[PDB]
């Protein structure tokens, strides 16, 4: 693992000790080499989970997340380039340093033998994402968005610390395979019910479902593109890796404590898909789309089917690549028009032919294409929830109706149409942006081709 | 389209609008041209009451009665044209309609692919930049200071100058391109 | 009717539109660029025969050597036939 | 499409060809620069009936806000030419 962690830590003198003309090319080329050396975790020739050291372990569910972190770092450092073409050198290198440090601690959070190391590097994300959002955000409400993000996640994460230290002083070591194998069943006690709520509330805030979903669209319309891609594509699902790894302690209580969170998840995903039908901001529309696609996997890990866990992990990496591509397209439209309203910029296919093709592929992976991992994960979650209850399929059917309607509503609004002709400043699409969405989409096509890597923890 | 609507439709304008809607919803109904010409001269045998009406309250009452008759006997699917709105080809050829600011963003390889046309477009842009500083001064002196301002733009009063607000009219793409 | 103030604008603008469309005409030198069923026989060699070679190599030697993937329906056996594989005859119908 | 483009003299000959086929138009009186109200003496219906003649002649729709203003064959030729966007 340390061949992935420590040269990512040695990317910091690559940022701070090079010429300011050459920071972007050296850091992007060596971070693509970080992703190439982070493809080494796929050497599972057996069901024995890879444990390189007592510090770090590799899991089959955690390895497409770990290639998505090391692959998401150069996709953020591409997209920050014309975002930071006017800022000066030490703020540019501080942005690259905060992005690289976020990548380092996300790699180290996904490689966690011990759950309190997971909590340390789980709450270590809350500083550099706040540095990205509340300094380089382009609107007024980024202070309120940073306060919302920071305090939603800390008021979730404080009883996670309480329940982790209580579980540790109850049973011994918080190592994940130790507490997988030596553990006992939990008695049906009300203190254990409050332990369930305390250890689950951090991940229940980090994955947005109703009651606690509201920090995500503020910290997506007030974020930059690298903060929005990290908060839409791996750092939101760091809590989903935690929600997967917590539940092995406490599986006997989930079959009666599961019901309000599946309820709030399903009615939150119907109402957030209904929210996205009438939205002005395109980044807010992709943000509430991420809320609905996270409420699906909130229901999927609140049930403990193995089928659900495969559909969960498939929805993790499909939602991360699809929402990262959609937010990159929203940043491209924001770069052209200096606004994020979908209504004011229509008919863009007449001037951008291939950006219409990447818009079509991103929103037609958001609308879940059948060989893609989006309908593969959603169909396996539909299988598991119909195994849970036979009357639940109308709710997710209404959700898939309105997700088709908001995806093709965003295509028909911002791509097809009359071509608004009051914009001279629709400059043609950059080679950066076209290869950035190509390096988003071509991993989704190869992941469609080989879905054996993405099967998760449980088959 | 090329002219401008008024603040209010007059009685003659509403009567001729009813005549136009009547003589297209007829031939939406009476499909054959013999029935169209017989019922169109029956519509002239219906206009002959409205010729010398002098009160104008009774003319607006007859306008309301004829409009209620038109909405009662109107076609559920009216006659539509390929170039009309609600039609077969209403803004069908918008794949062509990419305006003249997008030719500024062409590569120099594609600009050298068309030598003389870009030199003549440079001449048209020179005509724009030498006409605009007298075009925008013309509107601020032909603008009336009173509270009523019309929609129709003034022409070129000065000899040798272009009309004001000319580029968005003169550089629309063609409606039937190919 | 038509007022002459709008008529002068429309006359000058229609002259400018005729000038703009005659300028949008292309010059004759302006775009500068850098047998019977023989192509049908060439397509029948280069896109029928060689993909039949590739897909037939696939079907006979990567597919049919792996089991339970090319499974035929049972062909119909009638009273009066003789199956070549074991040499037996079917008894005739009544 | 397979339809030929329309010349100015062809459009003028087509507009004059429909306009001489009206019953209350003298073809020797009819020139291209003659006003419908004060030079051929027509009524309020006949101008919009000339507009319906151009509607079923040229296969496109003239709006009524332009069609009230159109009053003579020369700018009905120039309006039909500027709507179909012909270079001469």
């Amino acid at each position: 693992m340390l061949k992935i962690i420590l040269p990512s830590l040695m990317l910091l003198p690559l940022t701070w000790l090079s010429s300011p003309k050459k920071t972007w090319t050296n850091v992007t080329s060596y971070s693509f080499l970080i992703s190439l050396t982070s493809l080494t975790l796929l050497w599972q020739t057996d069901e024995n989970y890879k444990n390189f050291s007592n510090m770090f372990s590799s899991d089959p569910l955690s390895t497409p997340l770990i290639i998505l972190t090391a692959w998401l770092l150069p996709l953020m450092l591409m997209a920050s380039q014309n975002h930071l073409k006017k800022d000066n050198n030490v703020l540019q290198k501080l942005y690259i340093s905060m992005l690289i440090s976020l990548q380092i601690l996300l790699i180290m959070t996904f490689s966690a033998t011990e759950l309190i190391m997971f909590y340390i590097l789980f709450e270590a994300t809350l500083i550099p994402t706040l540095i990205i959002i509340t300094r380089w955000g382009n609107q007024t409400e980024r202070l309120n968005a940073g306060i919302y993000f920071l305090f939603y996640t800390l008021i979730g994460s404080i009883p996670l610390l309480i329940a982790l230290i209580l579980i540790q002083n109850h049973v011994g070591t918080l190592n994940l395979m130790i507490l997988s194998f030596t553990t006992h069943t939990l008695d049906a006690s009300w203190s254990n019910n409050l332990l369930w709520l305390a250890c689950m509330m951090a991940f229940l805030i980090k994955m947005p479902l109703y009651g606690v979903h509201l920090w995500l669209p503020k910290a997506h319309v007030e974020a930059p593109i690298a903060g929005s891609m990290i908060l839409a594509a791996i750092l939101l699902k760091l809590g989903s890796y935690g929600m997967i790894r917590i539940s092995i302690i406490l599986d006997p209580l989930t079959k009666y404590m599961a019901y309000p969170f599946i309820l709030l998840s399903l009615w939150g995903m119907i109402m957030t898909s209904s929210i996205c039908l009438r939205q002005t901001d395109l980044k807010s529309l992709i943000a509430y789309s991420s809320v609905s696609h996270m409420a699906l996997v909130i229901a999927s890990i609140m049930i403990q089917t193995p089928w659900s866990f495969m559909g969960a992990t498939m929805l993790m990496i499909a939602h991360g690549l699809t929402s990262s591509l959609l937010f990159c397209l929203a940043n491209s439209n924001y770069e052209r028009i200096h606004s994020r309203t979908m209504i004011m910029a229509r008919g863009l296919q007449m001037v951008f032919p291939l950006m219409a093709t990447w818009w079509l592929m991103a929103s037609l992976a958001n609308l879940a294409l059948p060989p893609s991992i989006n309908l593969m994960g959603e169909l396996f979650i539909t299988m598991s929830l119909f195994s849970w209850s036979n009357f639940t399929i109308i709710l997710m059917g209404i959700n898939i109706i309105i997700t088709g309607m908001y995806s093709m509503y965003m295509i028909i609004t911002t791509q097809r149409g009359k071509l608004t002709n009051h914009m001279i400043n629709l400059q043609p699409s950059h080679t950066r942006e076209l290869t950035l969405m190509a390096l988003h989409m071509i991993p989704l096509i190869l992941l469609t081709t080989s879905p054996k890597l993405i099967t998760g923890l449980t088959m | 389209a090329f002219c401008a609507p008024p603040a209010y439709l007059t009685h003659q304008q509403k009567v001729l609008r009813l005549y136009k809607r009547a003589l297209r919803h007829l031939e939406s109904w009476c499909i054959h041209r013999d029935k169209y010409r017989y019922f169109a001269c029956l519509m002239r045998a219906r206009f002959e009451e409205h010729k010398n009406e002098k009160d104008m309250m009774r003319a607006t009452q007859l306008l309301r009665e004829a409009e209620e008759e038109f909405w009662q006997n109107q076609h559920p699917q009216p006659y539509i044209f390929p170039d009309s709105p609600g039609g077969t080809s209403f803004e069908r050829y918008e794949c062509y309609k990419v305006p003249e600011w997008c030719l500024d963003y062409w590569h120099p390889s594609e600009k050298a692919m068309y030598p003389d046309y870009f030199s003549k477009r440079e001449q048209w842009k020179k005509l724009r930049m030498e006409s605009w500083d007298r075009e925008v001064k013309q509107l601020q002196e032909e603008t009336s200071p009173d509270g009523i301002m019309t929609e129709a733009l003034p022409p070129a009063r000065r000899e040798g100058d272009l009309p004001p607000l000319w580029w968005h009219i003169v550089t629309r793409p063609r409606e039937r391109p190919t | 009717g038509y007022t002459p103030d709008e008529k002068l604008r429309l006359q000058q603008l229609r002259e400018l539109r005729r000038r703009w469309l005659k300028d949008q005409e292309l010059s004759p030198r302006e775009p500068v660029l850098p047998f019977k069923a023989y192509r049908s026989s060439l397509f029948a060699v280069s896109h029928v025969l060689i993909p039949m070679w590739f897909v037939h190599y696939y079907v006979k030697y990567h597919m049919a050597t792996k089991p339970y993937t090319i499974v035929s329906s049972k062909p119909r056996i009638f009273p009066g036939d003789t199956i070549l594989e074991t040499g037996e005859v079917i008894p005739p119908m009544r | 499409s397979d339809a030929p483009p329309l010349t100015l003299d062809g459009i003028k000959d087509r507009v004059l060809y429909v306009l001489k086929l009206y019953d209350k138009i003298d073809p020797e009186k009819l020139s291209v620069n003659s006003h419908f109200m004060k030079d051929l003496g027509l009524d309020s219906l006949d101008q919009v009936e000339i507009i319906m003649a151009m509607e079923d002649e040229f296969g496109f729709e003239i709006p009524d806000i332009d069609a009230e203003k159109l009053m003579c064959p020369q700018e009905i030729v120039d309006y039909i030419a500027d709507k179909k966007d012909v270079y001469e």
Binding site: - | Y96, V98, E100, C102, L103, E110, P177 | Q24, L26 | P5
Partner: peptide
């Protein structure tokens, strides 16, 4: 029948 210039965005990029 002389060819009219088709107007088109920059396909080089």
């Amino acid at each position: 029948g002389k060819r009219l210039f088709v107007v088109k965005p920059s396909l080089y990029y």
